[PDB]
Symmetry: C6
């Protein structure tokens, strides 16, 4: 039995968090990863192979697909989740090393230090979430249409192209938007709780 | 040997459940996941590649497939199982944190609190199951036909399209319906048992 | 070292079984799963992609393949093995919970109960095996021919279609039949042994 | 530290084996599995997709491929290795249960039994190896030619077909033959050793 | 519980490193591997299958693709990360063996040795990073264009070819460049810290 | 904590090896396996599917590809590494069994034996490496050209065929050659060290 120090680490990491935030946020993270890995990823498999355009011009399909989709939704979401997750990993590593140093100090010699970093990490999580949402809104919006109009060389004049599985992708896009909004709300709630408990001194 | 606290956690989680519900429900969950992962998923692999329509119009197959299948059955079932499973995970996390707090209290100082949450979780499981069943009934029904009639642009007039493996998919749809009904019945039985043991005080 | 309770569980599960049945049945289960997972599954990979028919009618291949194979052999066998395996898992869970309850009783306070369930589980294993064998015999038989005659709309008149790897699939079908028969015989032997030891009182 | 009983089990399993047989046979088994899993399996991937025949007759390629290859070499070898391996697993299970029973006896109450089964297992290993070698020799031989002549309906007269990667497959076939011969020789040596140590009493 | 010597090893490995370098560099390594494995690798899947050229000359596409891409970006990055990682593994092995030898010495008999190797390893990490960046700049630059002009035999005169997913690949190239620059900066900072603490004696 | 006997085994295995050989050779093995598994294997995926020839003769591509590549480079390298690795596994097994026997002897009864086998194993490692290098030099050389000339039936006269990714494969071939040479040099150094320490007695 060697799982005790893990309990101590967990307790020290979540010193300033609310009772409900732990459960809700962790389960949301698990839900996010499972949804992205099982169902979402497979629906984008034939994103380019099933993409078709009405033309005989060689090379037009390539450029029209590139123009329609500068970056895939799934890879964008992977980047988003990695960026939202990195700060917590940094905080965990910092806490681990601090605990080791404190053990050294208090063995050989028989607020603000960690609160500030925690606040910064939460702020950066929220900032990254908002930035990714804004970028997605600017680039794509939150829906996909069946027919796309392409006006890029070497295609002559304008051509019509047809997407793959637009409705299913729209449904999943809405799901991901809802998940992101919930996560942002929870993080904002945590920030307000910490600041409102700090005011009373 | 460090598996004792796991036994305590398991005992405290299942305080209010019946003797048979544990076994039947857990085995049903295992059966559900195995069936979805091994046999069901592979049968839908060529759902769009083997989909064909009788026409020379470019883009008609894409739109007709999109209209026929707004969302795949397998991904719908994955969403259903995740939604049905989340509440139990939330309850487990809550119980774990409560047990840690109680250990702190009863070490340093040498009904209704948890019953309500358990009842709420069971109710939400049943609610999600019923909602998913109703949505599936409204959208698809519980069978698939070999020939589909498509009347969507840019297809001219109406066209005929042909599905892949309709009979096998019908069989698996019936299987999944039966499994869902059994799960709903077991949850309702658990609710009735708890309420009937609460009446006698 | 924390593997003792596992030994106790194993001993209590196999109280009423014969000496040889354990080894033979467990090794048969391992053989079944390995054979199904390694060699059998790969041979059915191109079951529909390599299926061909002599015709120019669009949609005829889809319907003819659907008629020829209402359900794939591999998925049928997966269903069979899952159904044959579930009762033992149920019995194991029941025994585990009973043992925990008995430990509680005999710690705090310092035939027929389990025999009946064991008999029922063995009976249901045999029943499922026989039912699956009968269904397979009725639907397919125990061989596959190279040429198939199709008389389904929209195909005009009758058409000829050609299967993929008929001889190899026939060989594997015979193998699976032999395995199923051996398993059924072993289960029947166990039933006879228990009933013949119960007669002498 | 709970690895002691494993050492006892290993010692009791290999009571009657020679000093060198252990190492050589175990390393040969590891070599066999690695070779089959890493290099051999990938070389047969496009066995049917790259198979081609000179004809316009629909369905001729299917039947000609089926006639040329009643069963794939890789799946045949998988069956061979499973059959050669099962007896040792049976013997291990028997020894495990016997050891548990003996522990019970010698705790509560503070040659020929196992030798015969070991001899039978070794004999069956050798028998299966020889049978598989004979079957392979009768069906295929130990080489593959680039051009195959097909005289099966519905192909008219005779047609020429061309295999994929014949030389590489020939090389691997020779490798597998050598491995099988070495294994058979080692098993025969073990049999002779046991019988020659039994003669002196 | 047998995780203590691992703690000692970790402490002795990071004797001369700064407090922040540990966390930042380790998290950067994890980020690098995750990004390369999840999102980046899949975007290059159809790098050659979707590559197209405007010509009827057989063999022109092969040679034009070979000329355009002497080596794939993903495999280049895999080589880069392996080369950047090997020195730390060498240092860890050296430290492990030195610790074992010191344990022998100090049990049986009841700066510069390791600092130099650490400095050399850090220097080589930075050197490899810079070399790979320079090679990539010389060969490809840091962007990809949609249209490529090919003037290689047997293609007649010059031909136009079209890439797959140029914009997404450009985005990921920029990401990887930023990551490499950050890693180089951190290593240089570590070198300066060690040399500036060595000056004061 | 049960990792002590592993330390003893490691110490006894490396009794006669030099201080640096351990680290360098082990890291080289890890580098070899990682390089072969991650980057090299994927570059040969479309070795036959992207192989093309200028002709209308059916069957010519098959025979020309077979003649050009009697065996794939990746599978050749897998065979090489397995052959180079087997002797060390044999030596480890022998040492393990010898240690068990010595424990028996020295518990119940409260150079040349192993040196010779170690020398033989090292010699065989070097021999296999040299043999594989010579075979590769004789068959292929150490580069690949873009255009191949084929003069095999049923192709008429001579035909031109075009390879896939020749430059990248050439680069990786050079890398593997360098790795093999380094490994051979290290093994020769170990042999010279042991023989030069044996001369002084
Ligand atoms: C585990 C079983 C729970 C029993 C348990 O109490 O374990 C706790 C270990 O913490 C933990 O359970 C931490 C486990 C962390 C990883 C396990 C989950 C793997 C998957 C996670 C995915 C990402 C989220 C110890 O608690 P204690 O009562 O002994 O208190 C000690 C305070 N000094
Ligand atoms: C395990 C072997 C069973 C023996 C056993 O009794 O283990 C129990 C641990 O509980 C458990 O066995 C919990 C194990 C939970 C995970 C194991 C299953 C993995 C796959 C599950 C898939 C999802 C369902 C301890 O019981 P005890 O007698 O010591 O009582 C302690 C009450 N304080
Ligand atoms: C394991 C090594 C065998 C040594 C051994 O005796 O372990 C036994 C544990 O039982 C067991 O060995 C049970 C292990 C169950 C899982 C291991 C197999 C995994 C794969 C199985 C696939 C499905 C079949 C303990 O026995 P003991 O002598 O201490 O007696 C205790 C009676 N109170
Ligand atoms: C393991 C490290 C070796 C050290 C060691 O001695 O472990 C032995 C355990 O046996 C064993 O090492 C058995 C391990 C069996 C599985 C490990 C290999 C996994 C992959 C195998 C592939 C199939 C072949 C114990 O030996 P001892 O000195 O304590 O003697 C005890 C006699 N009562
Ligand atoms: C693990 C849970 C943390 C608790 C803990 O303190 O474990 C430390 C073990 O070090 C470690 O935690 C080292 C673990 C190394 C591998 C675990 C990570 C796997 C994935 C890594 C990917 C590559 C990066 C022991 O620390 P202590 O307090 O007992 O001090 C001992 C100083 N003598
Ligand atoms: C492991 C963490 C290192 C700490 C450590 O000292 O472990 C040593 C175990 O040896 C070992 O660390 C052997 C581990 C062997 C496998 C671990 C690597 C897996 C991947 C390898 C790929 C192939 C290469 C014990 O050493 P000690 O100080 O207690 O001395 C005991 C001499 N009686
Ligand atoms: C082993 C390596 C290569 C990958 C797996 C390690 C990390 C990437 C994992 C381990 C624990 C995970 C965390 C577990 C749960 C949370 C929930 C959530 O964070 C919080 O709940 C913070 C507030 C709180 O916990 O009280 C956001 C994701 C996060 C940080 C996870 C992010 C990813 C983490 C750091
Ligand atoms: C490790 C993480 C990333 C994924 C795996 C963890 C959970 C998703 C698993 C662990 C235990 C599972 C549960 C085990 C068994 C049950 C049976 C069933 O629930 C009940 O039986 C509730 C009533 C009772 O147990 O008495 C419904 C599924 C559920 C909750 C499972 C849902 C999924 C759970 C929570
Ligand atoms: C971890 C979960 C998600 C999947 C793996 C757990 C079960 C599906 C496994 C564990 C042990 C297995 C059993 C091990 C061996 C047997 C042999 C055989 O049953 C018997 O031999 C019963 C009679 C006897 O054992 O004496 C039939 C399969 C069965 C029950 C297996 C069925 C599948 C079981 C229950
Ligand atoms: C099990 C084998 C087959 C593969 C996995 C083992 C190694 C390849 C791993 C184990 C730990 C890893 C290291 C963990 C973290 C670091 C962070 C970073 O190095 C440092 O931070 C050095 C400075 C410091 O740690 O203070 C660069 C990658 C590196 C060395 C990693 C490189 C890859 C390592 C050596
Ligand atoms: C678990 C099984 C199925 C596969 C994995 C086990 C073996 C194939 C591994 C375990 C340790 C490995 C060895 C670890 C390191 C070395 C380095 C190198 O050998 C030496 O360094 C010998 C000289 C020395 O170590 O001092 C060549 C590869 C070799 C023997 C490896 C070959 C493959 C080995 C034997
Ligand atoms: C996705 C479904 C909606 C999830 C939002 C649930 C948020 C409820 C928070 C409960 C109170 C937290 C303290
Ligand atoms: C008993 C719990 C079962 C969990 C099922 C997990 C399925 C595997 C999904 C792996 C891909 C998603 C994570 C990247
Ligand atoms: C699917 C097959 C049908 C499963 C339904 C079994 C329900 C029986 C419940 C037994 C009594 C529970 C207390
Ligand atoms: C001994 C028990 C064997 C269990 C077989 C499991 C097969 C692997 C299936 C993995 C996919 C389904 C879960 C997502
Ligand atoms: C498949 C090969 C045939 C297996 C049948 C073996 C059954 C023999 C049972 C031995 C006695 C059991 C008590
Ligand atoms: C040392 C034993 C090796 C076992 C080989 C297992 C091969 C992996 C097969 C996985 C698929 C079959 C189970 C679903
Ligand atoms: C395959 C290469 C040939 C392997 C044959 C080696 C057999 C030698 C047996 C040594 C003595 C055993 C006691
Ligand atoms: C350190 C040892 C590495 C072992 C490499 C194993 C490669 C994985 C091969 C898995 C397929 C073959 C077994 C079925
Ligand atoms: C709970 C943490 C989940 C981690 C997700 C990892 C996904 C698997 C990615 C594997 C490929 C990248 C490493 C090579
Ligand atoms: C591949 C890069 C070159 C590796 C060769 C390094 C050999 C150096 C050996 C150092 C001294 C060993 C005792
Ligand atoms: C933390 C270390 C990560 C190691 C990455 C390994 C990637 C998986 C590669 C597996 C194929 C190569 C071995 C056969």
């Amino acid at each position: 039995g060697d799982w005790s120090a893990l309990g101590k680490l967990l307790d020290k990491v979540q010193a300033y968090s609310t009772a409900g935030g732990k459960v809700w946020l962790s389960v949301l993270f698990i839900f996010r990863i499972l949804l992205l890995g099982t169902a979402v990823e497979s629906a984008w498999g034939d994103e380019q192979s099933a993409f078709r355009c009405n033309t005989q011009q060689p090379g037009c399909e390539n450029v029209c697909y590139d123009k329609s989709f500068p970056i895939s939704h799934v890879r964008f979401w992977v980047l988003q989740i990695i960026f939202v997750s990195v700060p917590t990993l940094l905080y965990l590593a910092h806490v681990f090393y601090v605990m080791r140093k404190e053990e050294k100090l208090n063995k050989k010699e028989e607020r603000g230090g960690l609160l500030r970093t925690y606040i910064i990490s939460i702020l950066f999580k929220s900032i990254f979430e908002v930035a990714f949402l804004l970028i997605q809104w600017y680039i794509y919006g939150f829906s996909l249409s069946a027919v796309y109009t392409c006006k890029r060389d070497p295609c002559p004049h304008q051509v019509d192209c047809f997407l793959s599985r637009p409705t299913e992708k729209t449904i999943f896009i809405i799901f991901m938007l809802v998940v992101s909004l919930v996560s942002l709300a929870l993080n904002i709630i945590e920030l307000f709780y910490v600041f409102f408990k700090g005011v009373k001194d």
